[PDB]
């Protein structure tokens, strides 16, 4: 009310309203789902269009050969944060000849988002990210929120009506976690998960967006006729 | 007052949303993409009859293979075009090749959110970026001050945008010829324009792989206007 | 290097050799020393290879930006001055460039500008630049007239490079010919000295110093 | 942050006026009146000191009339402290010109640069404008004797006779009435004092409440002399014109 | 622009079937003066890497601090710091190689020659060299300073190419290293008798040996040598 | 972080007033009375030492300050603001004059430099005006003795005699009756003590009154001998005993 | 005074065929009269069917290759996974080299691959970025020994048709991958014989539309 | 540095600071530009509440940017000096690098760009000025007349007016100016310009300034008597 003019102001109950309003931008964004087994990690994203004449907004971005994310909210902010991740992944490779740990990737994003919530003039990032990756400790899935809070999970979902997919994954936890050495079945589980967040619309060929990374699988994105298999 | 980079309770940037209102006040611009080329057309909208309409430059070349049409606070587009031209030429210098239309649009959209308390406010102009490259062929992009860009088969921006867009929804199909697209832009422009459409208050342009980006003469457009009127009366 | 360009009745002739050296080591015999800036502008390159090629490709980008911004092809004067002002900023840093900006525009007509790395910029009708410039001057000056035909002018330019290619140790390989008219530049072929020398010797009856 | 406390000194009103410039002019309108009158053979500068106290040291005092160089002087109306900042800048600018060209600075050039500084404070920087209006009186070999005025807006104009500060409306009407083009310095001296004498808010105009200066070619052959009047010299000129 | 003051001489090393061996004497020379005798020039990083450093000792101590700090930084927010996300020899080397080349590029080098010896997580032997110029190379045997001239020839007789590595045991490999250290004591004027030796094995791990001495030396023949040509007494 | 206050905190109001300067003058009005009187052969400056507590040692707090050997200063208003101004005033006398001309500045020019500092606090970003009015008494070879007042606006006026602060209105009236152009220094000191007794309420003695003069050169206070041209400081602070001697013949 | 440059010796060689291209280089690394490594590769697969080698001062050579490899990576990120053509790579490398015009990379760079018509391509660079496409180029310590041999055997220079009175030149033709590898091996054995900094081993990288293949051969170790 | 974003968008999509800068232009004295067949004429109003002025030294309303281009304006006088100075510097800079004087379009584009930059730069307010830029391109005889405004938009005009009561004089020009046949001579062009100002000015004494620009750097300012002759001629023809 009087305490939402900027990010540098606390409310009387100890809330940061600008951070909460940034969180609201994610809820308006299109749904995206993340899940993993022990061998592979999968991102599934429902892309959104302006109208029938327009293209479908790309939700998934590659960060390295072993890491990438899906976005929900302000796309330009995802571009800034993904670019930062690309550089940090790259710095780790050039300097230490070392693939950046997915956990460190989360720590770096947390700290970058935080600085924007404590200083005058700047604003919080208006996007949520689901980072997947395969590093020296196996498959990983992270959930980034622009408050700074990063959380490692077996599966999750963010965006509009994400609660449907998140409930499904909470039921399916014991099943999909053990889908080891089988990419297509882990994707199927993700596609069935995102389907629990659909209303009136269904998954079409230029609507669905899937990405996968794993043990002997570099981070690759599937769009167009390549996802027709999973409909 | 309040911060420039402030979020509303709904989760939108106030200044970005207000700049979108400025674009709605602007003159109409329409773009249509085909397999034979991309057509760009604009409403000039002279504020007075004494104003020499040929000096109204709302369609602009970025490179030989990329063209651009604008709508809104058109003065703000000058630094955007300057950046686009430099980005295009610079990439040719670094890589001895034409730059992808998408990559060019992305470079322009990176300027968009570089405002706050960098420039003092967002741009008050929307752009239709049309071009061709070897990979993705003929393309049409709509670049907003939010930093977002969508590819379009056809798109209208400006004051008559929502009425024109609904018309483009019905008329567009994947087998449109270049000549058919040219007439379609003129047709839809004449429908949404306040004053009566002619060669002096409206301008056409296109981009083809063979001849590159070309702004049409007032003589050429006048014949297309005459061809358009005859075809509508013919049934 | 040996490069020349001269102005005459029928426009501009531009001729260059194709050798590149690193000391006495002949590093290449097939270097392109004429840079096509646009259909109406040419630039020649003598001196440091990288310096000339890098900054003249850059010059082409600056000339392209001019015609985008101004909706008009850049003048030969303005193009040459962009390059001369650039190298002048680097004066003392050790750039090595001996170039000639040749072209046609409506307002100027056929025009040649000599531009070098110590900031010198000169408009003129005849210039020869490079380690073998003096050898080219000797033949060019002694046979030059304004009323030369396009055929004779092309040959003189070719013959002048050949003369320098023969005598100058740091020039040779092949001759690249260009002709600049009101309609733009026209390429007149690559001419290997290996065959061109003996062809000229026999037909012309010149080069009597050499064992036939 | 600090946005909360920003007055925004360099913005337009809905009517297209600069708030701070307008309010600075309102401030200047309460300052002691200063009058400039340009004659064919010289210039007069007359100014009224702000409500003087009897224990004020009058002879070793400078409030209104300042010297910029040997050929140019100014009369001040507004905040004195603000005026001194601008005066030192103007003095430096004149010396830079002399150092560069080996010639004394033309009057307009000095006036323009000082007026450009004021303009800057209205368009950028977020600072308050200088609450000062100058009357420039000077001479150069191009235009001869010149009178200018500048105000917080940074706008300057040339004059034959002008007033700044308090009661300019009444003062300008009186100058416009009695001024004529073929006027001499001694006549202009009389006009300047008579105008102040009628427009003054004080009971009676006296020597101790005035500053006076002339810029004549009254020196020996083709050269200009600046005369900043002493207290006794003002007392004499006031008696000579029959005001006291 | 520098000049080295207190200096360390040769660092020698080689690969064997299950790991790597590295050695360096304990001397800190001050020109011709053999100033400091208790200098350790082999610095372990974790339980799987040893960095051997020659050249300027002040810069060596700086590099020690960097490696020490690298271990600390790696442990931050890292539950697997003593497991999968522990520091590898290749990570440690690439870091040093980056620093060395950055410093030479700023015309202010770390005046050192460095050999990073260790065993990777997958069991592979790691042995790579880097110096003040940022020049890097790898070989079955590596040595710095006089070691390059005198040790390498002797160590290459044992492991001349890649295929000789599985055929070389830790006993044979250590014997060659210890022999090389003796030869260097005979012939290098800025060497000492006392040295340290480190073995990084993929099975038995890191074995760090301190206070070794060159022994079994041949000096007896000296008594027979008289004069410089014609002298008989 | 960083100073984001790059804008003026003093601005013109619709009526043409500069609020912060007016309010600064109001703070000076609340301040304790101080005064200055110029004689033919000297200047005197004086003020009351308002003690915050009887446990406090009022000798440690100096309201009258030496700026140069021939210039002194006193104030009315906010003490801390005055203290830092004296520090800056002393430094600027060296940096902008003595290090250039090899001699101390004349009174009017040092006053001009102090006025400049106070003017900048009226216009510069993120600062308030100084809440003090200064009285600066001094001597120099070509101008002789002089007395100046400096206000929060940066405006300065030369005075024959004046007063500032709490009871300045009554004190100025008192000085108008007593002042003439033939006053000797001792007569000016006597008038200063009479004028100050009117505004002081409690104890009136050498311990509660602070008083200094700009008069004859003091070779005994120089600290060295051997250079004839160096004759010693004209600024002298009167002792507690010296004041009480003049209070008996009052 | 500190000298920031060094000479790591070695030599490299690029030959272009009709539908293939090879980039060869010896594996010896040296300083002064000492051998640092008998097998230290300096010919690298950089992705997008581009092979690269930067011979001379190894530290600068590694830095450059490292930077170009990184340039290829960011080219994909910024331009929708577009394949970097050999001509575009060459121009990019010019800017890398000329970027340090006043503190150069002391290396002779050669890249090889296929052009956009599917034909073999070899580009060569001087230390400060001057580049040229050729059928043939040798670089490094033994370049002066190998290059004239290549002129004769690859481009058929100074070779005329027998019995034509030195009037008809030997006609240019593309060489098979088998014939090219023969010339590479003979070039390196000859260079090994007469140049001290060349020997130990030879590593060839062959580039066809199918991908990047490797071949290794022993060289004399003296 | 002072960073505040003074020019910003409002809910209805307007930048009020730019629009309030237009109000300052509307307050300014009237300025008019009319281009003929072989010339351009810049007319300017001078308010007559200022007597006792010195017209020798008072800044003229029309300013030369180069020997071939001129700039008049309406709005804040102090602001106009900054634009004129920048334009004059750019004019010399262009001659230095391109070895050719600026075109009228280029000079206008530059000035317009400066005005635009002040609409989205922190710590600055827009210029309260609209300009009329007129002249002839080098080695060209086609007349050029451009207009700029605080927002930064610029455009070419056959004839145009700006400042106070400009909507009245624009109304006059719109019916009196023929595109098919512009003022054939200098006299015809000046007369139409004076006529248009006489709809608004008051008296045709020392209130109207006229400046005529012709090809090849031929610029001259008319005196009082010369202008007064046009005023006398127009009034006699009016009484009919
Ligand atoms: C005639 C042929 C006489 O030079 C012409 O002037 C030609 C002009 C053409 C090539 C555009 N100029 C040259 O051939 C020019 C001569 C020269 C050499 C050095 C400095 C200035 C001028 N040659 C070059 O520029 C060569 C071109 C190579 C062979 C493709 N380049 C070099 O010599 C390079 C880079 C020189 C350099 C410049 C600035 C900073 C650092 C280096 N140098 C080497 O390759 C060194 N060397 C070659 C032998 O092998 C060991 C390394
Ligand atoms: Mg050999």
Q: Which domains does chain E have, with CATH numbers?
A: 1-233 (3.60.20.10)
Ligand closest to G200 (CA) is 2
CA angle D140, D142, D148 (to 5 degrees): 60
Q: Quote the CA–CA distance of F27 and F11 in Å, as a whole number.
A: 18
E207 among known catalytic residues: no
Q: Which residues is E197 bridged to in the sheet?
A: E23, E209
Q: Return the C-alpha torsion angle A209, A212, A218, A221, nearest 10.
A: 0
Q: Quote the CA–CA distance of H90 and G221 in Å, as a whole number.
A: 69
Listed by start position, the domains of chain H span 1-240
Of G67, G73, G76, G81, which to mutate for an interface test with A (greatest number of A Cβ within 10 Å)? G73
* Contact assignment for G91 to B100 by CB distance below 8 Å: no
Using an 8 Å Cβ cutoff, are C100 and C114 in contact? yes
Measuring CA to CA, how many Å separate B86 from each of C62, D30, F108?
9, 56, 59
Residue closest to F160 by CA, chosen among F8, F36, F31:
F36
Of G27, G59, G107, which to mutate for an interface test with E (greatest number of E Cβ within 10 Å)? G59
Distance of CA H238 to the CA centre of its chain: 27
**A1-231 under CATH 3.60.20.10, yes or no:** yes
Give the fold, CATH level 3, of H1-240: 3.60.20
Task: Identify the CATH number of the domain in which residue D126 sits.
Answer: 3.60.20.10
CA closest to E103 among chain G residues: G4
Cα of A137 to nearest chain F Cα, Å? 40
Chain E neighbours, 3+ Cβ pairs < 8 A: A, G
Q: Torsions phi, psi of B2, nearest 5?
A: -165, 160
Q: Which residues of C touch H102 (CB under 8 A)?
A: none
Burial of C30 (0-12, 13-18, 19+ CB in 10 A): middle
Q: Quote the CA–CA distance of G177 and G15 in Å, as a whole number.
A: 10
| Six-digit token string for A47 | 């892309």
Q: Quote the CA–CA distance of G15 and A180 in Å, as a whole number.
A: 47
Q: How many residues are present in chain F?
A: 250
**DSSP-based three-state secondary structure for G208:** strand
Residue closest to A113 by CA, chosen among A4, A18, A2, A225:
A18
Q: Quote the CA–CA distance of F120 and F154 in Å, as a whole number.
A: 8
CA closest to H151 among chain B residues: B75
Q: Which residues of B touch D3 (CB under 8 A)?
A: 1-3, 117
CA closest to A120 among chain F residues: F1
Cα of A206 to nearest chain E Cα, Å? 40
Q: Quote the CA–CA distance of C190 and F179 in Å, as a whole number.
A: 107
Q: Which residues is F35 bridged to in the sheet?
A: F46, F163
Listed by start position, the domains of chain C span 1-212
For residue G27, the 8-state DSSP code is -
Question: C1-212: what CATH class?
Answer: alpha beta
Q: Do chains D and G touch (3 or more CB pairs under 8 A)?
A: no
Sequence-separated (6 or more) residues with CB below 8 Å from residue A127: A25, A26, A29, A71, A72, A73, A74, A75, A77, A78, A81, A146
Measuring CA to CA, how many Å separate B199 from each of B67, B185, B188, B220, E196?
20, 13, 15, 9, 91
Q: Return the C-alpha torsion angle H159, H163, H165, H167, nearest 10.
A: 40
- Count other Cβ atoms within 10 Å, centred on residue E123: 10
Q: Quote the CA–CA distance of F24 and G215 in Å, as a whole number.
A: 89
Measuring CA to CA, how many Å separate C8 from each of B73, C111, C163, H27?
52, 10, 21, 62
Q: How many residues are present in chain H?
A: 240
| Six-digit token string for D38 | 């340009």
Q: Quote the CA–CA distance of E26 and E211 in Å, as a whole number.
A: 9
Q: What is the CATH number of domain B1-235?
A: 3.60.20.10
Q: Quote the CA–CA distance of B134 and B209 in Å, as a whole number.
A: 9
Using an 8 Å Cβ cutoff, are D16 and H20 in contact? yes
Measuring CA to CA, how many Å separate B51 from each of A187, D234, G1, H45, H75?
62, 63, 72, 22, 21
Q: Which residues is C26 bridged to in the sheet?
A: C21
Q: Quote the CA–CA distance of G131 and G135 in Å, as a whole number.
A: 13
CA angle E170, E171, E173 (to 5 degrees): 60
Dihedral sign for Cα atoms in the order H21, H26, H28, H34: positive
* Contact assignment for A98 to E98 by CB distance below 8 Å: no
**DSSP-based three-state secondary structure for D168:** helix
Q: Quote the CA–CA distance of C16 and B7 in Å, as a whole number.
A: 64
Could you give the maximum distance between any two Cα atoms of chain G, in Å? 62
Q: Quote the CA–CA distance of A84 and A104 in Å, as a whole number.
A: 13
Superfamily grouping for domain F1-250: Aminohydrolase, N-terminal nucleophile (Ntn) domain (3.60.20.10)
Model resolution, angstroms: 2.7
Using the Cβ of G92 and the Cβ atoms of chain B, whether some distance falls under 8 Å is answered with yes
Ligand 1 atom with the shortest distance to the CA of G104 = 41
Q: Which residues is F145 bridged to in the sheet?
A: F139
What are the percentages of helix, strand and coil residues in chain A, rounded to 5?
A: 35, 25, 35
Cα of G21 to nearest chain B Cα, Å? 21
Using the Cβ of D3 and the Cβ atoms of chain B, whether some distance falls under 8 Å is answered with yes
Sequence-separated (6 or more) residues with CB below 8 Å from residue E63: E43, E51, E53, E96, E110, E112, E114
- Count other Cβ atoms within 10 Å, centred on residue E85: 19
* Contact assignment for B13 to A126 by CB distance below 8 Å: yes
Q: Quote the CA–CA distance of E159 and E167 in Å, as a whole number.
A: 9
Sequence-separated (6 or more) residues with CB below 8 Å from residue C113: C76, C77, C80, C100, C101, C102, C121, C122, C123, C124
Which region, left, alpha or beta, applies to residue G49 given φ > 0 means left and ψ of -120 to 50 means alpha? Answer: left
CA angle E108, E109, E112 (to 5 degrees): 160
Q: Quote the CA–CA distance of G29 and G43 in Å, as a whole number.
A: 13
Sequence-separated (6 or more) residues with CB below 8 Å from residue E228: none
Q: Quote the CA–CA distance of D74 and D62 in Å, as a whole number.
A: 12
Domains of chain G: 1-222 (3.60.20.10)
Measuring CA to CA, how many Å separate B7 from each of A5, C68, H122?
9, 39, 20
What are the percentages of helix, strand and coil residues in chain H, rounded to 5?
A: 35, 25, 40
| Six-digit token string for G10 | 């070695």
Task: Report the residue among G11, G127, G137, G145 best suited for mutation to probe ligand 1: largest number of ligand atoms under 8 A from its CB.
Answer: G127
**DSSP-based three-state secondary structure for D8:** coil
Using an 8 Å Cβ cutoff, are E28 and E57 in contact? yes
Task: Report the residue among C16, C32, C47, C116 best suited for mutation to probe ligand 1: largest number of ligand atoms under 8 A from its CB.
Answer: C47
Q: Which residues is A44 bridged to in the sheet?
A: A33, A210
Listed by start position, the domains of chain B span 1-235
Using the Cβ of D124 and the Cβ atoms of chain B, whether some distance falls under 8 Å is answered with no
Sequence-separated (6 or more) residues with CB below 8 Å from residue C155: none
Q: What range defines the domain where residue D63 resides?
A: 1-244
Residue closest to A54 by CA, chosen among B18, B156, G78, B68:
B156
């Amino acid at each position: 009310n009087n305490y939402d003019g900027d990010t540098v102001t606390f409310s009387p109950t100890g809330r940061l309203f600008q951070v909460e309003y940034a969180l609201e931008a994610i809820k308006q964004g299109s749904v995206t789902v993340g899940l993993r087994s022990n061998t592979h990690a999968v991102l599934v994203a429902l892309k959104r269009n302006a109208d029938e004449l327009s293209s479908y907004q790309k939700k998934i971005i590659k960060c390295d050969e072993h890491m990438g994310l899906s976005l929900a909210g302000l796309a330009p902010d995802a571009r800034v944060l993904s670019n930062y991740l690309r550089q940090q992944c790259n710095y780790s490779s050039l300097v230490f000849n070392r693939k950046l740990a997915v956990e460190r990737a989360g720590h770096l994003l947390c700290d970058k988002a935080q600085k924007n919530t404590q200083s005058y003039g700047g604003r919080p990032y208006g996007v949520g990210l689901l980072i997947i990756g395969y590093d020296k400790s196996g498959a990983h899935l992270l959930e980034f929120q622009p408050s700074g809070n990063v959380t490692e999970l077996y599966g999750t979902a963010i965006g509009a009506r994400s609660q449907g997919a998140k409930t499904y994954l909470e039921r399916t936890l014991d099943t999909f976690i053990k889908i080891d050495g089988n990419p297509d079945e882990l994707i199927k589980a993700g596609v069935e998960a995102i389907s629990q967040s659909l209303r009136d619309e269904s998954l079409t060929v230029d609507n669905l967006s899937i990405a996968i990374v794993g043990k002997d699988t570099p981070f690759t994105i599937y769009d167009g006729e390549a996802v027709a298999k999973y409909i | 007052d309040r911060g420039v980079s402030t979020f509303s309770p709904e989760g939108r940037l106030f200044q970005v949303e207000y700049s979108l209102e400025a674009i709605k006040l602007g003159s109409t611009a329409i773009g249509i993409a085909t397999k034979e080329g991309v057509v760009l057309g604009v409403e000039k909208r002279a504020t007075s009859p004494l104003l020499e309409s040929d000096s109204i430059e709302k369609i602009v070349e970025i490179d030989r293979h990329i063209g651009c049409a604008m709508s809104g606070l058109t003065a703000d587009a000058r630094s955007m075009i300057e950046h686009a031209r430099t980005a295009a030429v610079t990439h040719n210098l670094y890589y001895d090749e034409d730059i992808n239309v998408e990559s060019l649009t992305q470079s322009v959209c990176d300027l968009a959110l570089r405002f706050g308390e960098l420039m003092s406010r967002p741009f008050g102009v929307a752009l239709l970026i049309a071009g061709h490259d070897a990979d993705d062929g003929y393309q049409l992009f709509h670049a907003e001050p939010s930093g977002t860009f969508y590819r379009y088969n056809a798109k209208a921006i400006g004051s008559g945008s929502e009425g024109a867009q609904a018309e483009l929804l019905n008329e567009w199909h994947s087998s449109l010829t270049l000549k058919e697209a040219e007439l379609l832009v003129l047709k839809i422009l004449k429908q949404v324009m306040e004053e009566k459409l002619d060669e002096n208050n409206a301008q056409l342009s296109c981009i083809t792989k063979q001849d590159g980006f070309k702004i049409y003469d007032n003589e050429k457009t006048a014949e297309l206007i005459k061809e358009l009127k005859e075809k509508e009366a013919a049934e | 290097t040996t490069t020349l360009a001269f102005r005459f009745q029928g426009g501009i002739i531009v001729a260059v050799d194709s050798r590149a050296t690193a000391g006495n080591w002949v590093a290449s015999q097939t270097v392109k020393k004429v840079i096509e800036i646009n259909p109406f502008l040419l630039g020649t390159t003598a001196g440091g290879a990288a310096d000339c090629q890098f900054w003249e490709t850059w010059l082409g980008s600056q000339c392209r930006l001019h015609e985008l911004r101004e909706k008009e092809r850049i003048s030969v004067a303005a193009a040459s001055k962009i390059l001369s002002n650039l190298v002048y900023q680097y004066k003392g840093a050790g750039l090595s460039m001996g170039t000639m900006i040749c072209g046609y525009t409506r307002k100027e007509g056929p025009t040649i500008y000599y531009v070098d790395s110590d900031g010198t910029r000169l408009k003129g009708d005849i210039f020869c630049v490079g380690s073998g410039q003096t050898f080219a001057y000797g033949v060019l000056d002694s046979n030059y007239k304004w009323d030369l035909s396009v055929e004779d002018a092309l040959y003189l330019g070719k013959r002048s490079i050949l003369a320098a290619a023969h005598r100058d140790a740091y020039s040779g390989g092949s001759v690249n010919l260009y002709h600049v008219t009101e309609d733009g530049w026209i390429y007149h072929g690559n001419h290997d000295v290996g065959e061109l020398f003996w062809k000229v010797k026999e037909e012309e009856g010149s080069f009597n110093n050499v064992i036939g | 942050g600090s946005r909360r406390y920003d007055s925004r000194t360099t913005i337009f009103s809905p009517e297209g006026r600069l708030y701070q410039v307008e309010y600075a002019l309102e401030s200047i309108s309460h300052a002691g009146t200063a009058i400039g009158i340009m004659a064919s053979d010289g210039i007069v500068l007359a100014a009224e000191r702000k409500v003087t106290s009897t224990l004020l040291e009058q002879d070793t005092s400078t409030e209104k009339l300042y010297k910029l160089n040997d050929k140019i002087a100014v009369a001040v109306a507004g905040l004195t402290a603000d005026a001194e900042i601008l005066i030192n800048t103007a003095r430096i600018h004149a010396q830079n010109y002399l150092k560069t060209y080996n010639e004394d600075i033309p009057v307009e050039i000095l006036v323009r640069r000082l007026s450009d500084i004021k303009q800057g404070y209205t368009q950028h920087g977020g600072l308050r404008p200088f609450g000062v209006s100058f009357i420039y009186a000077g001479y150069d070999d191009r235009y001869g004797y010149q009178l200018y005025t500048s105000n917080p807006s940074g706008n300057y104009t040339g004059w034959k006779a002008i007033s700044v500060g308090a009661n300019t409306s009444a003062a300008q009407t009186l100058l416009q009435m009695d001024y004529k083009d073929d006027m001499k310095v001694d006549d202009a001296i009389e006009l300047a004092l008579k105008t102040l004498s009628k427009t003054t808010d004080s009971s009676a105009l006296t020597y101790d409440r005035l500053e006076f200066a002339t810029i004549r070619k009254g020196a020996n052959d083709g050269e200009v002399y600046q005369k900043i009047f002493k207290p006794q010299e003002i007392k004499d000129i006031l008696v000579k014109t029959g005001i006291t | 622009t520098q000049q080295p003051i207190v200096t360390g001489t040769s660092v020698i090393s080689m690969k064997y079937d299950n790991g790597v061996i590295i050695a360096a004497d304990n001397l800190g020379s001050y020109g011709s003066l053999l100033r400091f005798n208790g200098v350790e020039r082999l610095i372990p990083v974790g339980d799987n890497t040893v960095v051997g450093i020659s050249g300027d000792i002040s810069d060596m101590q700086h590099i020690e601090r960097l490696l020490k700090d690298l271990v600390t930084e790696n442990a931050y927010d890292n539950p697997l710091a003593d497991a999968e996300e522990a520091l590898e020899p290749s990570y440690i080397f690439e870091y040093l190689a980056t620093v060395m080349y950055q410093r030479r590029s700023k015309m202010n080098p770390l005046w050192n020659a460095i050999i990073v010896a260790g065993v990777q997580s997958n069991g592979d032997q790691f042995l790579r060299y880097v110096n003040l110029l940022g020049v890097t190379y790898s070989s079955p045997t590596l040595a710095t300073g006089f070691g390059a001239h005198m040790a390498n020839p002797l160590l290459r007789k044992v492991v001349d190419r890649e295929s000789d590595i599985p055929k070389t045991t830790v006993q044979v490999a250590e014997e060659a290293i210890v022999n090389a250290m003796r030869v260097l004591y005979y012939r290098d004027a800025r060497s000492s008798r006392n040295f340290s030796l480190a073995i990084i094995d993929k099975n038995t791990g890191l074995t760090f040996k301190k206070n070794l001495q060159v022994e079994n030396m041949k000096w007896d023949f000296a008594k027979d040598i008289k004069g410089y040509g014609t002298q008989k007494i | 972080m960083t100073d984001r206050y790059s804008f003026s905190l003093t601005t013109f109001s619709p009526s043409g007033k500069l609020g912060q300067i007016d309010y600064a003058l109001t703070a000076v009005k609340q301040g304790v009375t101080s005064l200055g009187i110029k004689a033919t052969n000297g200047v005197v400056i004086a003020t009351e030492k308002k003690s915050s507590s009887p446990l406090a040692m009022s000798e440690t707090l100096s309201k009258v300050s030496l700026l140069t050997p021939d210039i002194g200063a006193v104030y009315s208003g906010m003490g801390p603001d005055y203290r830092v101004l004296v520090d800056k005033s002393r430094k600027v006398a060296h940096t902008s004059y003595k290090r250039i001309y090899g001699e101390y500045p004349p009174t009017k020019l040092l006053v001009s430099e102090v006025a400049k500092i106070m003017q900048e606090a009226t216009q510069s970003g993120g600062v308030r005006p100084f809440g003090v009015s200064l009285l600066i008494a001094g001597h120099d070879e070509f101008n002789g003795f002089s007395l100046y007042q400096v206000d929060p606006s940066g405006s300065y006026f030369p005075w024959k005699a004046t007063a500032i602060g709490k009871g300045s209105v009554a004190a100025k009236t008192f000085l108008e009756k007593r002042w003439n152009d033939e006053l000797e220094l001792e007569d000016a000191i006597h008038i200063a003590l009479l004028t100050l007794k009117e505004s002081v309420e409690g104890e009136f003695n050498g311990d509660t009154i602070e008083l200094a003069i700009i008069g004859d050169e003091n070779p005994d206070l120089l600290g060295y001998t051997g250079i004839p041209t160096d004759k010693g400081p004209r600024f002298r602070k009167l002792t507690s005993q010296e004041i009480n001697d003049r209070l008996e013949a009052l | 005074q500190f000298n920031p440059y060094g000479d790591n010796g070695g030599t490299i060689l690029g030959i272009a065929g009709e539908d293939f291209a090879v980039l060869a280089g010896d594996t010896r690394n040296i300083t002064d009269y000492s051998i640092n490594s008998r097998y230290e590769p300096k010919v690298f697969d950089c992705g997008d069917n581009i092979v690269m080698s930067a011979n001379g001062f190894a530290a600068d050579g590694d830095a450059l290759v490292k930077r170009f490899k990184n340039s290829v990576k960011w080219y994909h990120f910024d331009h929708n996974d577009k394949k970097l053509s050999i001509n575009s790579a060459a121009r990019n490398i010019q800017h890398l080299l000329y970027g340090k015009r006043f503190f150069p990379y002391y290396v002779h760079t050669i890249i090889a691959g296929l052009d956009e018509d599917g034909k073999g391509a070899v580009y060569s660079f001087d230390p400060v970025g001057s580049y040229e496409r050729e059928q043939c180029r040798a670089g490094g310590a033994a370049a002066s020994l190998i290059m004239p041999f290549l002129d004769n055997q690859v481009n058929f220079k100074n070779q005329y048709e027998p019995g034509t009175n030195g009037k008809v030149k030997k006609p240019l033709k593309y060489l098979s991958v088998e014939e090219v590898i023969k010339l590479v091996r003979d070039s390196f054995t000859s260079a090994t014989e007469r140049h001290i900094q060349v020997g130990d081993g030879l590593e060839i990288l062959i580039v066809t539309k199918d991908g990047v293949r490797k071949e290794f051969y022993e060289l004399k170790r003296d | 540095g002072y960073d505040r974003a003074l020019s910003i968008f409002s809910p209805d999509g307007h930048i009020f600071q730019v629009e309030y800068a237009l109000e300052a232009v509307k307050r300014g004295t009237c300025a008019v530009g009319v281009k003929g067949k072989n010339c351009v004429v810049l007319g300017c109003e001078r308010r007559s509440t200022l007597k006792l002025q010195d017209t020798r030294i008072t800044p003229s309303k029309v300013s030369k940017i180069d020997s071939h281009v001129v700039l008049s304006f309406s709005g804040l006088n102090a602001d106009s000096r900054i634009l004129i100075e920048k334009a004059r510097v750019e004019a010399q800079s262009h001659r230095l690098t391109l070895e050719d004087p600026v075109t009228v379009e280029y000079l206008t584009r530059y000035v317009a760009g400066v005005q635009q930059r002040y609409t989205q730069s922190g710590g600055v307010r827009p210029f309260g000025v609209s300009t009329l830029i007129a002249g002839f391109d080098p080695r060209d005889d086609e007349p050029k007349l451009y207009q700029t405004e605080p927002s930064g938009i610029y455009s070419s005009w056959s004839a145009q007016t700006i400042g106070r009561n400009s909507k009245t004089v624009r109304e006059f020009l719109e019916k009196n100016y023929d595109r098919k046949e512009p003022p054939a001579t200098v006299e015809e062009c000046v007369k139409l310009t004076v006529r248009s100002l006489l709809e608004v000015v008051q008296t045709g004494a020392k209130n109207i300034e006229i400046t005529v620009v012709k090809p090849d750097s031929d610029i001259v300012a008319l005196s009082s008597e010369e202008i007064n002759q046009y005023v006398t001629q127009i009034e006699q023809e009016k009484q009919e």
